[PDB]
């Protein structure tokens, strides 16, 4: 029963803030992805080591107790679509889905 907001907005050329709240946030990590209308989603951020995965300049991520923080680049121009959020249960069985925010 994870919780991702579905309606937030921000000005272009400014830092934004994407969250996703859920109790099974330990052995799950975080997905997001941005599906432009009628297209296929791509890697929002990808794990290439067990330590961290915010190496690319465009995006970074932070971790809180339950809510997850998807910080983004300074310029928010040209790239806009709804950002979902996905994770896995503690038994490493199941993948929860719970919406995601469309940003304008």
């Amino acid at each position: 029963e994870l919780t991702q907001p579905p309606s937030v907005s921000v000005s272009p050329g400014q830092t934004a803030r994407i969250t996703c709240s859920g109790a099974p946030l330990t052995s799950r990590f975080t997905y997001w992805y941005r599906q432009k209308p009628g297209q296929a989603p791509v890697l929002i951020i990808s794990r290439s080591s067990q330590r961290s995965s915010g190496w690319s300049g465009r995006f970074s991520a932070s971790w809180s107790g339950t809510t997850v923080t998807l910080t983004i680049r300074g310029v928010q121009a040209d790239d806009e679509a709804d950002y979902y959020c996905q994770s896995s249960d503690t038994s490493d069985s199941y993948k929860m889905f719970g919406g995601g925010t469309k940003l304008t």
């Binding site: 067990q50 330590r51 971790w63």
Partner: protein, 53 residues
Amino acid sequence: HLENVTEEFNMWKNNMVEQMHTDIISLWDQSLKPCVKLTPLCVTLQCTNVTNN
């Protein structure tokens, strides 16, 4: 090689393993007595789990 002889051995009553057991013990301590003692290592340790993201 001994011929025509049939001496009765014993393994679980053999004393060669007993002197071996006790030799290695006194040898272990003899190689550790002249080394760094770690007595001021018993102090209140404040630890936290390692970085697992």
